């Protein structure tokens, strides 16, 4: 859907790249927000239920602690922060990398500062009234 | 030489481009072209040239012509004047809309190209998903049409003030009186066509445009069964030619009483039909493109839903193999497939094509669509809106010249009132009475005033005129193969229409119309229905029937009043 | 030079991402050319001489064999193949 | 009224747009502006008006006028005709180059915008990093200029062609003779200025334009010392106004003998000066922009080299702190800093500005530079090239009218020879003798025909003309403040400039010029030197001196021939 043509085949190396990117995003979140130093690795990103649609569930754990699962909300926040940096890694455009719970929204477009239609109609109405007045005055002057 | 043809081009107007394609779309397309051809080849020519000859010979206004023929026949000109004034009120609103669009065509990015986001700022408005951006702009941004005709709202601010602006523009154009010219008319006649070539090229260069051509060309059988197509085509051709308004007669009276009027009539009709067909081609190309795009979007959405549900590999499920995959999936998982079935939709190219965009403002919601994928939208948008504005201004100038002339001879009132003051009063009164088309439900009133039972009294006016000509005063004592008509085309076979079959033609479809009116006994008007995004049918209220009945009566009962008005004097 | 503004700071996480991308490129080269499955890791890309100019030397070894060093020519070929895919990962345009 | 100004606007030509900015750049800019004005008020105005008055009063051709004044003054017209011929041969090549540029302006992407890659396909051509794309296109693609004048190559193909096609265009324009018109002149005069407004706008919207304006306005001291600037300015104004050609006189003859010739002269001189100044503004804005861009690139390269060498943080080393960082780094590590010191360059804005682009084709390599950064380059490129082509065509028409007139009276040959054959023969002869400018080193010959020993005899013609006027035939016996010429210019103090200072001024700068000519004993022509990308000075060969001496002598010894012819009558 995104590339149409020239799309690379999805092999194991792509999964490795995805896991590394997820670990990088988690590191960024834990460094720039909570001011802690956590060394995440690609082996701490568990994945399951791989499908030909390239659909799979995943979650993240502690560096070396199996019985420690990172709660989902912090992972959601990290993904929200680093989605822009993740998207261009695989040449996606946020329309082919939906996370089923994280919808993107940034920047309300508000372009018109002056309502150009109003001022344009104003100048036209001014010119038309001055024209009609000068014309009726000329007609009266011409008896 | 070429100056005669350039002058004669003026016959084009805002009925060939604005109104003809809407009617063509409304009645199936191909099923609408042949009745137009028949009505042109049997009705337009005889009546048009006979009128022109009457105007040339009488050398005076229609009222004086009626006095010459019969004192009983008085009042036809009054009815034509009332019909013209009724036309003018709702006519000027088209110029108002053109002004609105031209003024809004200066912003970047252009409107009707992107959709306002939802209040969540996470997606687009659901109305835009239902109805495309152009439809949303024309139905909610610029009209705010109420869900039903019965519901009404307060008068709006933009349409009223724009209508006022257009009315003062018309008044200025009347007052200046700088209509006489011989060199700019070349430019005014060449601009419409050269503008239309660009849009024709862009429409023909876009994918799927040929489907609109097959749709508008190929006639059908069921659509031809209805009789309303014939009356609608007759009304359309009468409105486009303008006969019965009393403006032609005038013109003809103006010109020197030695000219081959038949050549003028045929050269007018040919160019009118050719321009109408050309405009229909240009519009229907873009319409077919839009329909094809919507069909493709339907297919894409269905494919995406199926792929997401069944986790099929992307790209594997194509449009061609849709049926095979559907059957195989139904075989594989019959239970959940059957459960999901009601949620599944099915694309229908034909139903989509014949009903994609409908209503009065078709030409507004189609070309703007074409505008949204221009190389430089603003340029061609401005050119097209300016062409529409100038054509509307010329048409308004006409039907005004039509209305003013009978009131000009009223010396009894003009003795103490200058003509400028009377013209201004008339313009202000018509502007005030045209205010009824600027509320949240005024659009339905406008369609009533333009399409439903609108200008049907023109048919009875023409019928009265032709039966009056067919009497002993015509072709038996007066116009009896006289030399006065330049000695050429004297009493030729063309009489077999204008003295022969045409009168019957007038009642042949009238009887069908009145038969269907009583047989069905039901009338339906289109409503927007923003809740779904598609037009629906609703029933007219009783007072709508009452007002349309009195409207047609106002132009119907004129002659019987004149009969008694002459008989009372005849008694003494 | 490339981004001009909005340039992200170069911290250790960027180096980790770069090493992972290099390992991915090496895996792709060894799979699509020599038809071998070699499981490179981010610890198999040794880096040295880090500079404020974001300049450093690096090389690649066997998955778990310190005494084995991949020859430079094969690494150059792999980088030639995967430079386009590396570039957009850091929003660079082959000039930075 | 406006038609008078529209007709007088034919005073504009290629001496105002193509040649004036080149000379302005050649002599430092501002230091060239002020002498022009001094040479505009005191030199062009009086001589031009006096000529015009003489032509109006004489009522016949220049040759016949010279015979009427005295057999002693005969022959000057022959020198004027030869000068016009020599001007035409090298003048048509400008139209040839304009045709070449217009023909190549149809591709997409346009040339002179990107650079051809090296033979390795990995990088760009070294010539491009030496000289910019426009310079490379003008010096190698369309000229293939040899490194030196001594080097020679075969005659090229594309130039000879463009010259042939242009010459046949000129011949057709001669044969049609459709010079008489009164309606298109408005358009032909409006096109230049309206075209120039767009380029003025773009130049004002480009960064660094102010530096170019400051360079062109601010005068210098060193440039003003040389007299060659003065003599070149005098030649420029003479060529632009057209004194000494003998065409003005001929014009006068057709003109009605009732008009304020002083009014005509002032109205043409002011228009010419204003147009030249406006064109200089437009050109020098873009020139300053280009110089600023080159200076910025010079800074960027050095900054990048230093950053790479010393591994400094990116962005930290700016242009403002360049000197401080340079000194600090020199102090820190003197050894390797001194080692790589020869690789450092200093960006000098002033020396880059005074020498950024130079040569005859400046106007070609500047506007094209302003073209490659436009939204739609092809459009404005076509308009500019068409304006240049039409101006060159008009100027060539004037030159052809000048050259053809003396040969018309030759009844001895025209008795059996039609004028069309003579015109064609003259055209082909001029084209064949002008083939040398299409050969690989022909550009040097073109600069010779334009600058060195080119149109220098014009000042001698003006001097002998004003000497003849100053005799008894002026203000003493003939034209003695007569009331016949509308009673104006009768012994006014205006006579002073054409009886006083100006005849002294003709020889005032001549002695200064010839003083440096012998004192310096050196003369340099500019060459391309593709090995580096900058023009370098070389010495003229002996045969070049011989040919320019023969050329000036050919127009010099004409007067002694007439003196020898009339000596037999003088003695007896
Ligand atoms: C791994 O993560 C679990 C979950 O936090 C840790 O187990 C906790 O240990 C602390 C004390 O260290 C107890 O107070 C908690 O009750 C334990 N579980 C909970 C509910 O947090 C564990 O310590 C972590 N480290 C290892 C090596 O397992
Ligand atoms: C899509 O699939 C078919 C095609 O329209 C529709 O199935 C129809 O179901 C109705 C209701 O039982 C039957 O009367 C028709 O015979 C079925 N097929 C036809 C020919 O329509 C189904 O309704 C469609 N789904 C929609 C429209 O949502
Ligand atoms: C690790 O790498 C070294 C060198 O690549 C391997 O040593 C090879 O085998 C014997 C060991 O002495 C040497 O004679 C060879 O010359 C070595 N090959 C090369 C190309 O140098 C060593 O076997 C590897 N160890 C493992 C576990 O893979
Ligand atoms: C311009 O750049 C040149 C680069 O050569 C500089 O010229 C140097 O002159 C200094 C003394 O002023 C010498 O010690 C160097 O040997 C020269 N540079 C070389 C050849 O390495 C100079 O600094 C700059 N300014 C001027 C006016 O030339
Ligand atoms: C056809 C013809 C032949 C000679 S005149 C003439 C015109 C009548 C029809 C034009 N309009 C009539 C009203 C509607 C309008 C429109 O739908 O646009 C077109 C007239 S009548 C007065 C002036 C002109 C040009
Ligand atoms: C100034 C003037 C006043 C009345 S005429 C006239 C023109 C003379 C100079 C124009 N050219 C003269 C030759 C060079 C050329 C150029 O550099 O372009 C300009 C002439 S002379 C014959 C026709 C015209 C218009
Ligand atoms: C938008 O409106 C509110 C605010 O987010 C939200 O609860 C609701 O679900 C949204 N519905 C949409 C998409 O219109
Ligand atoms: C480019 O090719 C030329 C011609 O063979 C060669 O001399 C030069 O070394 C090459 N430069 C490179 C490889 O960039």
Residue numbers in the entry:
A (entry chain D): 626 to 768
B (entry chain C), D (entry chain A): 12 to 583
C (entry chain B): 626 to 721
Source paper text:
The related transporter SIT1 is found in a wider variety of epithelial cells including the brain. Mechanistic studies demonstrated a 2Na+/1Cl-proline symport mechanism and the position of the chloride ion is consistent with previous predictions of the ion binding sites in SIT1 (27).
The inhibitor binds close to the orthosteric proline binding site, but due to its size extends into the cytosolic vestibule. Nipecotic acid is the core of the tiagabine molecule and is a substrate of SIT1 and GAT1. Consistently, the nipecotic acid fragment of tiagabine is in the binding site of SIT1, extending into the intracellular vestibule. In GAT1, mutation of Tyr60 has a major impact on the binding of tiagabine. In our experiments tiagabine inhibited SIT1 with a non-competitive mode, excluding a competitive mode of inhibition. Binding of tiagabine to the cytosolic face of the transporter could kinetically appear as a non-competitive mechanism because competition with the substrate would occur on the cis-site of the transporter. Secondly, we present the first inhibitor-bound high-resolution structure of the ACE2-SIT1 complex, which may have implications for its role in epithelial cells in the brain, lung, intestine, and kidney.
